[PDB]
Write an enzyme that holds these catalytic residues in place. Structure first.
Site, PDB file in Angstrom:
ATOM      1  N   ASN A   8       1.299  -1.238   0.122  1.00  0.00           N
ATOM      2  CA  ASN A   8       0.178   0.420  -0.669  1.00  0.00           C
ATOM      3  C   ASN A   8       0.831   1.328   0.057  1.00  0.00           C
ATOM      4  O   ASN A   8       0.809   1.928   0.495  1.00  0.00           O
ATOM      5  CB  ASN A   8      -0.961  -0.068   1.040  1.00  0.00           C
ATOM      6  N   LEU A   9       2.353   1.174  -0.927  1.00  0.00           N
ATOM      7  CA  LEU A   9       2.757   2.496  -0.989  1.00  0.00           C
ATOM      8  C   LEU A   9       2.622   3.165  -2.546  1.00  0.00           C
ATOM      9  O   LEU A   9       2.530   2.462  -3.408  1.00  0.00           O
ATOM     10  CB  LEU A   9       4.326   1.757  -0.813  1.00  0.00           C
ATOM     11  N   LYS A  10       2.023   3.990  -2.338  1.00  0.00           N
ATOM     12  CA  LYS A  10       1.190   4.116  -3.557  1.00  0.00           C
ATOM     13  C   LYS A  10       1.191   6.228  -4.010  1.00  0.00           C
ATOM     14  O   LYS A  10       1.025   7.330  -2.920  1.00  0.00           O
ATOM     15  CB  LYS A  10      -0.022   4.082  -3.862  1.00  0.00           C
ATOM     16  N   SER A  11       1.014   6.565  -5.342  1.00  0.00           N
ATOM     17  CA  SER A  11       1.376   7.994  -5.049  1.00  0.00           C
ATOM     18  C   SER A  11       1.855   8.005  -7.127  1.00  0.00           C
ATOM     19  O   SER A  11       1.774   7.086  -7.374  1.00  0.00           O
ATOM     20  CB  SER A  11       2.325   8.750  -5.008  1.00  0.00           C
ATOM     21  N   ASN A  24      -9.048   3.677 -10.408  1.00  0.00           N
ATOM     22  CA  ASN A  24      -7.837   4.632 -10.033  1.00  0.00           C
ATOM     23  C   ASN A  24      -8.023   5.438 -11.223  1.00  0.00           C
ATOM     24  O   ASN A  24      -7.617   3.994 -11.844  1.00  0.00           O
ATOM     25  CB  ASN A  24      -6.648   3.419  -9.833  1.00  0.00           C
TER      26      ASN A  24
END
Ligand SMILES: Cn1cnc(S(=O)(=O)N(CCN(Cc2cncn2C)c2ccc(C#N)cc2)Cc2ccccc2)c1
Ligand SMILES: CC(C)=CCC/C(C)=C/CC/C(C)=C/COP(=O)(O)OP(=O)(O)O
Ligand SMILES: OC[C@@H]1O[C@@](CO)(O[C@H]2O[C@H](CO)[C@@H](O)[C@@H](O)[C@@H]2O)[C@@H](O)[C@H]1O
Ligand SMILES: OC[C@@H]1O[C@@](CO)(O[C@H]2O[C@H](CO)[C@@H](O)[C@@H](O)[C@@H]2O)[C@@H](O)[C@H]1O
Ligand SMILES: OC[C@@H]1O[C@@](CO)(O[C@H]2O[C@H](CO)[C@@H](O)[C@@H](O)[C@@H]2O)[C@@H](O)[C@H]1O
Ligand SMILES: O=S(=O)(O)C[C@@H](O)CNC1CCCCC1
Ligand SMILES: O=S(=O)(O)C[C@@H](O)CNC1CCCCC1
Ligand SMILES: O=S(=O)(O)C[C@H](O)CNC1CCCCC1
Ligand SMILES: [Zn+2]
Lengths: 485, 313
Positions: free
Chosen positions: B101-104, B140
């Site tokens: 869950n590391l997102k950008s 998304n």
């Protein structure tokens, strides 16, 4: 004034019909419809004289919102590290919100704001999301820093405006390093290409008198090709190999539609030949108005078709409405009044649904059930300002501006990267300066156009479309860089 | 307990550099011990422009704590190219980031840069990854934009076969079957069927598309996505609205209407009827439906429909 802007309370609230076809989208929509409509039922109608007993009062809780912003303005907890690359935005959201709320910062605090931001300025040009020894320049914090300096700065030696003036050449060079042949800009070195960068760059370039032909080449084509079949704009367009055709790369979205409409508008005041390439203004207006939610969802805006309403789109979609409206008006005049969106319903969304519940932290939010934040505080209020005041771009005001412009006054012209990248001559440069400056100051508050839902204590200040800063900030700031003081 | 980098012998030769905030900064963040220490050393590494394994490891440490740190991502990509690191291994690490869950913006842009540089002969496995990524997160925005870029970039290299395009349309149809109100999937359909350079646009091809759109409308009459697609389709190919009107007319009171919970009229069906009158030069009749939209059937947009009405009268 309110004949064509019916209140949410005066309309029938019914769910979006299912057509006997359930889906994940409808599940989410029905849930949100319940959250919002129930809060509306719990809250007194802002328009009523006899504010009914037992019901929640919807008045704008200005002091609670001031406290919310004050509490995190001088210290942020460790969890805010996710926004470490966005600290100029935290500045912008706070100082612009306070401007709208009519709360003055003392000079000592303003000086701190100026100092903080100047340390974000790198000598090679542009502002980054943190100190120059920590982060590289980026188009987005450049916009946020420049606007924050317009809000909290001044023309004295400690005011920051002097520093921006001295940085004009280097900021321009940073802008030129970001430029791609197809008309897109990367947001930073090795960074992504999108229309938010274009918007941010065009605002700053307009404000600081650093617009040249080479900076703008193909920029209009890139933006125009972001427009989708829906009428709104996507983040980017792809050039198929100068290019044979340009294709939009995603959905019409409120944020990118705001940036595209605003970018286009800024481009229309640059007197280059066959420039800018047109957009479909009517389709953009249509898309804008269609994003205003049904009564059951409080008449707030959503960001894209079949998604959920969100308080921040009050600025992104709502603030795009006067721009789209003016573009449509210009197109009809090129061949040859009631509000174009529900100004009342939008205010009701803000007052009833987007405010934090009373007696708590304060601040404004995405929707009921969501934590308030600085970003939503700023964008909710910016949108509320657009709904409250009837901002129009006035051709007679632009004419007045042209008449008072002094072309013999100005800061040194930027040296172009390419030898033929500048203006053909001094006359054409001065004509451009005049047009850019005169149009930037063309936005006026229409007499008799004010609608303050819930009474005059709910009134906030007037933000400028396209720029999103108060007119009283925009005028002396842009006058400084064009030497028109 | 955390071991400070000033106590580590791997970092003994590096003098950390403090954040240059100036006096009494506004909006300061109370950085964790780990994050501050990592940035102090990153500031030092980046100032001297060190391209090393320890520098690469340090960038991963930082982006895990702050996935949005664009400066560190830029430096990381420079490290990958300078050190001639395995770009395939970095892709797998990015897969781990999504799982954790590391997102950008930055992670997706990083993927794009990796795939641009790897430049595989067949991008099918990356396409498959994107599809799987979309299933639990079907709207998304960044993922959809990346899918557009991938097919666009690799198609210009002539690396997308007709079979590959075919299975993409199959996949898009299934996304719309699962949720007809997925506007992102409608946008993907528009790319595949209309806007992409290789789109099949013969006369019978446009006929097939109209059948699909109308069937979608009859399935879910209140689906704004389907209406917008219909209107965009007819406008893009300069097709008259009148011949299709019999299929829409029932929603104002080629596949025809058959549905419970379908209150009439549908606002966008009225817009269709109004625009079809304008097509026929019947401006008075068009004004009448705009007025009805303004006063009765879509009152939220009362002012807008009045504007449209005044354009006729
Ligand atoms: C859903 N959405 C609407 N707008 C965007 S964005 O333009 O890409 N933007 C906002 C991201 N964003 C998430 C978000 C916004 N609207 C709803 N969400 C979940 C956000 C950013 C800052 C704060 C604070 N304080 C709270 C939430 C990211 C951003 C981050 C820092 C500076 C500028 C923009 C996303
Ligand atoms: C100048 C500047 C920085 C402009 C900001 C523009 C902005 C608001 C862009 C929107 C970003 C977007 C693609 C996120 C949607 O996320 P989401 O899926 O969580 O939101 P959604 O469901 O409402 O679409
Ligand atoms: O339309 C002018 C408007 O009147 C004021 C009162 O001076 O507010 C009234 O009208 C608003 C908007 O319709 C309602 O919410 C009423 O409750 C309110 O009395 C003023 O705010 C001005 O905007
Ligand atoms: O990222 C490695 C580094 O980037 C280069 C240019 O590609 O310099 C940039 O990065 C440094 C360090 O982050 C900053 O000083 C930037 O301003 C500069 O543009 C290159 O020198 C390389 O070492
Ligand atoms: O069902 C008849 C329908 O109701 C009206 C309002 O009188 O529209 C409302 O109900 C629909 C649900 O079908 C929603 O779109 C609501 O937002 C709207 O208020 C009217 O337009 C009429 O067609
Ligand atoms: O208008 S706001 O809601 O922002 C301000 C607010 O909540 C303060 N109300 C106090 C309560 C105690 C008696 C005096 C007034
Ligand atoms: O719109 S008017 O200016 O005529 C009247 C107005 O501002 C009323 N504000 C009330 C006053 C009492 C506390 C709650 C807010
Ligand atoms: O380019 S300038 O000379 O204006 C200033 C400069 O190079 C600073 N580089 C830092 C080093 C640490 C990471 C972020 C960028
Ligand atoms: Zn939001």
């Amino acid at each position: 004034a309110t004949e064509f802007t019916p209140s949410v309370y005066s309309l029938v609230s019914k769910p979006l019909p299912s057509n006997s076809r359930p889906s994940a989208t409808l599940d989410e929509q029905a849930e949100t419809e319940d959250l919002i409509s129930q809060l509306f039922d719990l809250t007194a109608d802002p328009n009523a004289l006899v504010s009914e007993h037992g019901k929640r009062y919807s008045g704008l809780r200005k002091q609670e919102h001031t406290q919310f912003l004050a509490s995190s303005f001088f210290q942020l907890p460790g969890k805010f590290v996710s926004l470490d690359a966005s600290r100029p935005w935290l500045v912008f959201w706070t100082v612009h919100s306070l401007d709208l709320l009519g709360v003055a910062l003392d000079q000592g605090t303003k000086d701190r704001v100026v100092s903080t931001l100047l340390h974000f300025l790198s000598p090679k040009g542009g502002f980054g999301g943190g100190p120059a020894n920590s982060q590289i320049p980026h188009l987005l914090p450049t916009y946020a820093s420049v606007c924050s300096l317009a809000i909290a700065g001044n023309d004295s030696s400690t005011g920051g405006w002097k520093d921006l003036a001295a940085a004009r050449q280097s900021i321009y060079e940073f802008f030129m390093r970001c430029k791609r042949p197809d008309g897109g800009f990367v947001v930073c070195e090795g960074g992504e290409v999108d229309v938010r960068g274009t918007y941010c760059l065009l605002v700053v370039a307009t404000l600081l008198d650093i617009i040249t032909p080479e900076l703008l080449h193909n920029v209009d084509k890139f933006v125009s090709a972001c427009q989708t079949y829906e009428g709104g704009f996507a983040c980017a367009s792809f050039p198929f190999p100068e290019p044979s055709c340009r294709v939009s790369m995603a959905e019409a979205h409120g944020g990118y539609t705001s940036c595209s409409l605003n970018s286009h508008f800024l481009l229309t005041s640059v007197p280059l030949p066959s420039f800018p390439l047109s957009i479909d203004a009517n389709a953009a207006l249509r898309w804008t108005v269609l994003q205003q939610g049904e009564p059951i969802e409080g008449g707030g805006f959503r960001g894209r078709t079949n998604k959920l309403v969100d308080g921040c789109y009050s600025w992104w979609v709502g603030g795009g409405a006067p721009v789209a409206e003016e573009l449509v008006r210009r197109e009809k005049s090129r061949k040859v009044i009631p509000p174009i969106f529900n100004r009342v319903a939008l205010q009701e969304f803000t007052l009833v649904a987007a405010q934090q519940d009373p007696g708590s932290t304060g601040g404004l939010r995405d929707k009921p059930g969501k934590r308030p934040d600085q970003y939503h505080t700023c964008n909710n209020l910016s949108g509320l300002s657009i709904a409250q005041h009837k901002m129009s771009h006035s051709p007679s005001t632009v004419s007045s501006n042209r008449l008072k412009f002094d072309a013999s006054k100005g800061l040194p012209a930027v040296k172009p990267v390419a030898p033929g990248g500048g203006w053909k001559n001094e006359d054409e440069r001065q004509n451009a300066r005049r047009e850019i400056w005169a149009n930037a100051l063309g936005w006026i508050e229409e007499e008799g156009g004010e609608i303050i839902v819930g009474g005059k204590d709910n009134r906030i200040n007037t933000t400028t479309p396209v720029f999103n800063i108060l007119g009283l900030r925009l005028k002396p700031f842009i006058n400084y860089f064009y030497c028109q003081e | 307990t955390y071991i400070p980098m000033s106590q580590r012998r791997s970092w003994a030769d590096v003098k950390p550099i403090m954040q240059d905030d100036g006096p009494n900064p506004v909006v300061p963040i109370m950085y964790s011990e780990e994050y501050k220490d990592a940035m102090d050393y990153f500031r030092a590494i980046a100032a001297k422009e060190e391209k090393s394994e320890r520098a690469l490891e340090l960038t991963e440490i930082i982006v895990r704590m702050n996935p949005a740190h664009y400066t560190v991502w830029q430096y990381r990509f420079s490290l990958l190219t300078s050190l001639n690191k395995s770009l395939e291994d970095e892709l797998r690490l990015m897969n781990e980031f999504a799982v954790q869950n590391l997102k950008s913006y930055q992670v997706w842009h990083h993927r794009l840069l990796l795939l641009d540089r790897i430049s595989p002969q067949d991008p099918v496995s990356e396409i498959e990854y994107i599809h799987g990524s979309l299933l639990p997160d079907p709207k998304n925005y960044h993922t959809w934009a990346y899918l557009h870029w991938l097919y666009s970039h690799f198609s210009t290299l002539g690396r997308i076969s007709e079979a590959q395009w075919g299975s993409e349309l199959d996949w898009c149809n299934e996304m719309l079957r699962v949720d007809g109100r997925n506007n992102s999937a409608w946008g993907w359909r528009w790319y595949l069927r209309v806007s992409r350079p290789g789109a099949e646009t013969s006369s019978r091809s446009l006929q097939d598309e109209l059948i699909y759109i109308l069937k979608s409308i009859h399935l879910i009459p209140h689906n704004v996505s389907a209406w917008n697609y219909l209107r965009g389709f007819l406008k893009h190919f300069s097709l008259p609205l009148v011949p299709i009107l019999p299929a829409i007319l029932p929603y104002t009171a080629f596949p025809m209407p058959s549905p419970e919970d379908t209150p009439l009229p549908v606002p966008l069906a009225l817009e269709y009827l109004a625009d079809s009158f304008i097509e026929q030069n019947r401006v008075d009749d068009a004004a009448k439906v705009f007025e009805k939209l303004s006063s009765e059937y879509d009152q939220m947009r009362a002012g807008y429909w009045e504007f449209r009405r005044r354009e006729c009268a």
